[PDB]
Amino acid sequence: SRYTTEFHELEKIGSGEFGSVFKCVKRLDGCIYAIKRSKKPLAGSVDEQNALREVYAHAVLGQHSHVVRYFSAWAEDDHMLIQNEYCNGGSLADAISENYRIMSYFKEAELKDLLLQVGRGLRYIHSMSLVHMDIKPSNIFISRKVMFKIGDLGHVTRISSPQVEEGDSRFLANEVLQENYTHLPKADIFALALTVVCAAGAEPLPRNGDQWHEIRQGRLPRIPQVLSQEFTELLKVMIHPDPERRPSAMALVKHSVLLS
Ligand SMILES: C=CCn1c(=O)c2cnc(Nc3ccc(N4CCOCC4)cc3)nc2n1-c1cccc(C(C)(C)O)n1
Ligand SMILES: [Cl-]
């Protein structure tokens, strides 16, 4: 078994319908990797398509400091395995949860730094004519003096040849729900805005109903902390009903409120 042979299992760091993810040390180089191990999905199924989007996403992407690095992927024992960079700070979701537990928080300064860094990742992905389509706190990973990296490329698709498996409904732009895929990069921007709103301490986001529509009308959820009217205005325009009014990733990373 390549998995057993090449790696030693240290700790389970994820589990779900996707299988499990393990912190592993690679015997040859002594480095830590995050390795996802899943039942090989039924051929011609949602999970296979999702799985194919991820491998073929790296085929295009390669390497960037704000995208979780991919090293290898293989299949054995009717399981599939993908070997990714290990980010020692867990996901933004874990960090948000821990903030609530010990009652800490991300400074506004740190919200802007999160926005800029994930923005740089998106700028790169979009420049390769791809879109992530599942930006949310659980898919942003932290290396710790802090690097935010975009992970979980299973929903990644082409801009020009749009093939869309919808992301989490809590972070999903209305136009994607309306099967309008003419500006998918702006759907990532919408989701990033709500991701920062979660980090800023907002209540849990709605999965549907009134509050869900209220957000897609361009109204931010309640943020309990003191954010400048200017940083707020940036987050508001990022969830603009009209996706063409939302800034692109490249406009985002060059925005004044973010510099630097
Ligand atoms: C290889 C799979 C994707 N993935 C990375 O590329 C990837 C890269 N880095 C870390 N670092 C890290 C993650 C959690 C912890 N915690 C340990 C204490 O309990 C709370 C979780 C610590 C480190 N994780 C990564 N991944 C990971 C891990 C778990 C779930 C998932 C998904 C599939 C999105 O649900 N992904
Ligand atoms: Cl666009």
Side-chain angles (χ1 to χ4, degrees):
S1 168
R2 177 167 159 189
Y3 182 55
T4 309
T5 296
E6 278 202 330
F7 304 89
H8 176 67
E9 204 169 89
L10 289 179
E11 168 179 355
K12 189 182 281 190
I13 57 176
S15 61
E17 294 176 41
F18 61 85
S20 285
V21 184
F22 297 90
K23 180 192 185 177
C24 298
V25 52
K26 187 175 179 195
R27 307 182 189 281
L28 260 300
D29 66 18
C31 297
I32 313 299
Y33 299 93
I35 298 183
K36 189 166 72 183
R37 187 175 187 273
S38 317
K39 55 184 164 183
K40 231 211 161 185
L42 188 54
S45 66
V46 156
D47 285 344
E48 179 172 72
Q49 288 299 333
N50 266 4
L52 288 181
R53 282 181 280 271
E54 186 155 29
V55 41
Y56 288 120
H58 176 265
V60 173
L61 282 171
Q63 185 180 0
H64 192 267
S65 76
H66 297 293
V67 177
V68 175
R69 189 166 171 197
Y70 162 108
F71 290 91
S72 188
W74 67 97
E76 67 184 337
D77 298 331
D78 204 87
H79 282 77
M80 43 173 48
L81 297 104
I82 172 166
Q83 172 200 353
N84 283 337
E85 179 186 355
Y86 176 78
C87 303
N88 59 5
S91 78
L92 180 58
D94 300 303
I96 291 166
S97 292
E98 177 68 351
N99 272 346
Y100 287 111
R101 202 254 301 184
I102 69 205
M103 190 167 35
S104 197
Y105 60 94
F106 292 120
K107 306 296 224 172
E108 155 162 11
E110 287 190 69
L111 289 169
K112 296 182 180 144
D113 177 31
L114 165 66
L115 178 51
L116 178 54
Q117 282 194 43
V118 175
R120 284 186 198 275
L122 291 176
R123 193 245 309 259
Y124 175 64
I125 292 174
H126 294 171
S127 64
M128 298 300 299
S129 304
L130 298 172
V131 289
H132 187 276
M133 296 300 293
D134 198 27
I135 298 293
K136 52 176 175 164
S138 57
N139 285 338
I140 305 303
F141 291 94
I142 306 166
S143 306
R144 218 94 60 168
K145 65 177 61 154
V146 182
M147 294 251 287
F148 298 98
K149 299 169 186 279
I150 299 173
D152 199 345
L153 301 200
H155 293 69
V156 167
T157 195
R158 292 173 296 180
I159 292 173
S160 295
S161 173
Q163 185 64 60
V164 178
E165 174 48 88
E166 297 169 16
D168 198 308
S169 66
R170 293 170 308 183
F171 298 83
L172 182 74
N174 199 40
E175 68 272 4
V176 181
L177 192 62
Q178 292 183 330
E179 297 172 27
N180 185 351
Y181 311 143
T182 48
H183 304 288
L184 288 177
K186 300 297 188 64
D188 282 341
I189 297 286
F190 179 102
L192 176 49
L194 290 185
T195 298
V196 168
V197 162
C198 293
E203 295 302 320
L205 295 174
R207 284 157 188 98
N208 46 66
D210 285 339
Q211 301 194 339
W212 187 98
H213 290 95
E214 289 167 18
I215 290 175
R216 274 72 196 172
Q217 289 168 352
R219 279 53 172 272
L220 296 168
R222 225 150 299 262
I223 281 66
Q225 70 182 268
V226 184
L227 302 176
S228 66
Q229 308 170 21
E230 291 77 4
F231 182 45
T232 291
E233 214 68 0
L234 177 59
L235 293 172
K236 204 193 292 192
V237 74
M238 285 171 78
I239 60 166
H240 199 279
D242 193 324
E244 310 213 59
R245 286 262 245 121
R246 293 169 210 162
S248 62
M250 83 175 73
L252 182 59
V253 290
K254 293 179 179 179
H255 205 283
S256 165
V257 66
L258 290 185
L259 177 63
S260 178

